Design an enzyme around this catalytic site. Structure first.
Site, PDB file in Angstrom:
ATOM      1  N   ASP A 130     -12.453   5.669  -2.661  1.00 30.82           N
ATOM      2  CA  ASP A 130     -11.435   6.164  -1.737  1.00 30.82           C
ATOM      3  C   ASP A 130     -10.735   7.458  -2.090  1.00 30.82           C
ATOM      4  O   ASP A 130      -9.595   7.667  -1.736  1.00 30.82           O
ATOM      5  CB  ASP A 130     -10.425   5.069  -1.429  1.00 30.82           C
ATOM      6  CG  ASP A 130      -9.661   5.339  -0.169  1.00 30.82           C
ATOM      7  OD1 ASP A 130     -10.211   6.015   0.710  1.00 30.82           O
ATOM      8  OD2 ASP A 130      -8.518   4.881  -0.042  1.00 30.82           O
ATOM      9  N   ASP A 148      -4.571   5.827  -5.385  1.00 30.54           N
ATOM     10  CA  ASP A 148      -4.559   4.511  -4.642  1.00 30.54           C
ATOM     11  C   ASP A 148      -5.817   3.709  -4.852  1.00 30.54           C
ATOM     12  O   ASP A 148      -6.843   3.938  -4.194  1.00 30.54           O
ATOM     13  CB  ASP A 148      -4.275   4.646  -3.134  1.00 30.54           C
ATOM     14  CG  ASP A 148      -2.782   4.836  -2.799  1.00 30.54           C
ATOM     15  OD1 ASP A 148      -1.879   4.199  -3.390  1.00 30.54           O
ATOM     16  OD2 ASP A 148      -2.498   5.602  -1.868  1.00 30.54           O
TER      17      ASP A 148
HETATM   18  N1  LIG Z   1       3.687   8.139  -7.260  1.00 30.75           N
HETATM   19  C1  LIG Z   1       4.040   9.236  -6.554  1.00 30.75           C
HETATM   20  N2  LIG Z   1       4.685  10.294  -7.068  1.00 30.75           N
HETATM   21  C2  LIG Z   1       4.800  11.094  -5.978  1.00 30.75           C
HETATM   22  N3  LIG Z   1       5.406  12.296  -6.073  1.00 30.75           N
HETATM   23  C3  LIG Z   1       5.724  13.061  -5.008  1.00 30.75           C
HETATM   24  C4  LIG Z   1       5.238  12.791  -3.737  1.00 30.75           C
HETATM   25  C5  LIG Z   1       5.595  13.610  -2.670  1.00 30.75           C
HETATM   26  C6  LIG Z   1       6.436  14.698  -2.874  1.00 30.75           C
HETATM   27  S1  LIG Z   1       6.860  15.652  -1.671  1.00 30.75           S
HETATM   28  N4  LIG Z   1       8.410  15.996  -1.791  1.00 30.75           N
HETATM   29  O1  LIG Z   1       6.604  15.014  -0.420  1.00 30.75           O
HETATM   30  O2  LIG Z   1       6.109  16.866  -1.740  1.00 30.75           O
HETATM   31  C7  LIG Z   1       6.916  14.964  -4.145  1.00 30.75           C
HETATM   32  C8  LIG Z   1       6.561  14.148  -5.206  1.00 30.75           C
HETATM   33  N5  LIG Z   1       4.274  10.629  -4.819  1.00 30.75           N
HETATM   34  N6  LIG Z   1       3.794   9.400  -5.269  1.00 30.75           N
HETATM   35  C9  LIG Z   1       3.142   8.489  -4.499  1.00 30.75           C
HETATM   36  O3  LIG Z   1       2.896   7.384  -4.943  1.00 30.75           O
HETATM   37  C10 LIG Z   1       2.740   8.865  -3.109  1.00 30.75           C
HETATM   38  C11 LIG Z   1       1.411   8.860  -2.745  1.00 30.75           C
HETATM   39  F1  LIG Z   1       0.474   8.524  -3.642  1.00 30.75           F
HETATM   40  C12 LIG Z   1       1.041   9.214  -1.458  1.00 30.75           C
HETATM   41  C13 LIG Z   1       2.014   9.564  -0.535  1.00 30.75           C
HETATM   42  C14 LIG Z   1       3.351   9.563  -0.903  1.00 30.75           C
HETATM   43  C15 LIG Z   1       3.708   9.212  -2.195  1.00 30.75           C
HETATM   44  F2  LIG Z   1       4.995   9.205  -2.564  1.00 30.75           F
END
Ligand SMILES: Nc1nc(Nc2ccc(S(N)(=O)=O)cc2)nn1C(=O)c1c(F)cccc1F
Ligand SMILES: O=C(O)c1cc(-c2cccc(Br)c2)nc2ccccc12
Length: 257
Positions: A130, A148
């Site tokens: 995936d 994931d």
């Molecule tokens: N574990 C994890 N860390 C983050 N960090 C992150 C995510 C988005 C942003 S931002 N502000 O949208 O650009 C900034 C830092 N995401 N995350 C996830 O599990 C995760 C994922 F896998 C998919 C989608 C959303 C998530 F949240």
């Protein structure tokens, strides 16, 4: 062991897909992490309780710098909570939306980090199945992390874009599935869209089963050679991960520690 009262919850990082991911901090240690909150209601309706337990089981044992850590879990009368590593630089998906397309340097680096994580994965018989930009995160040094492991399992659905022929046809598949995904990623990183994209699922199915992709003019021969070798109908005709890490396009454009 774990309760919601142990963490201070913050800004949303993404939305379900059944449940959201929130930024959080552990009160006792001040450890910043990400909390994925899935709802038992939605999980029941999709019948994914066995798959999620399976995901958490697999993901909590793995240790690699390019695989996102799961530290632990818990649940309430109504929700299941996953305690994940927080990747500060967000998704590769959002990076690609910002730049449209990546340069050879950034792509070869990302593919190296990806192959490495997959060698490690396959060396514990785990096949991801995936890999896609929305499931790839970026750490504080901009290093790629696979996120994931929901649809993962021991070898040997939404959009079909990343699935190989043997899977979309329901045929038996093994480790060579992830090699296809790599080729799809390598294509999308350089071009800005996946090679079998389409306005409908039915057309994308045709495109994949028939391996119908053409390269835009900016794609260089070294990239065209690695992508072409990865996008084979016959899984045994795909190269090994070793061969990919040692490809001349990769070695001439990647990075090292
Ligand atoms: N574990 C994890 N860390 C983050 N960090 C992150 C995510 C988005 C942003 S931002 N502000 O949208 O650009 C900034 C830092 N995401 N995350 C996830 O599990 C995760 C994922 F896998 C998919 C989608 C959303 C998530 F949240
Ligand atoms: O009510 C429960 O006991 C329950 C528990 C869990 C659960 C518990 C611990 C870890 C994980 Br992953 C999932 N998942 C569910 C998923 C759907 C419905 C119920 C549940």
């Amino acid at each position: 062991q774990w309760a919601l009262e142990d963490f201070e919850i913050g800004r949303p990082l993404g939305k379900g897909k059944f449940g959201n991911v929130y930024l959080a901090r552990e009160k006792q240690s001040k450890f910043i992490l990400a909390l994925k909150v899935l709802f038992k209601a939605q999980l029941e309706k999709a019948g994914v309780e066995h798959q999620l337990r399976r995901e958490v089981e697999i993901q909590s044992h793995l240790r690699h710098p390019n695989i996102l850590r799961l530290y632990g879990y818990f649940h309430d009368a109504t929700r299941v909570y996953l305690i994940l590593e927080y990747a500060p630089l967000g998704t590769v998906y959002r990076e690609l939306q910002k730049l449209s397309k990546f340069d050879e340097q950034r792509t070869a680096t990302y593919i190296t980090e990806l192959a490495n994580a997959l060698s490690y994965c396959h060396s514990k018989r785990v096949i991801h199945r995936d890999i896609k930009p929305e499931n790839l995160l970026l750490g504080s040094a901009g290093e790629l992390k696979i996120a994931d492991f929901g649809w993962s399992v021991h070898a040997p659905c939404g959009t079909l874009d990343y699935l190989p022929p043997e899977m979309i046809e329901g045929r038996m598949h093994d480790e060579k599935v992830d090699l296809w995904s790599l080729g799809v990623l390598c294509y999308e990183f350089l071009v800005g869209k996946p090679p079998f994209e389409a306005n409908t699922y039915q057309e994308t199915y045709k495109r994949i089963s028939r391996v119908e992709f053409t390269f835009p003019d900016f794609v260089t021969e070294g990239a065209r050679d690695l992508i072409s070798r990865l996008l084979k109908h016959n899984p045994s005709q795909r190269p090994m991960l070793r061969e990919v890490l040692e490809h001349p396009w990769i070695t001439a454009n990647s990075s090292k520690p």
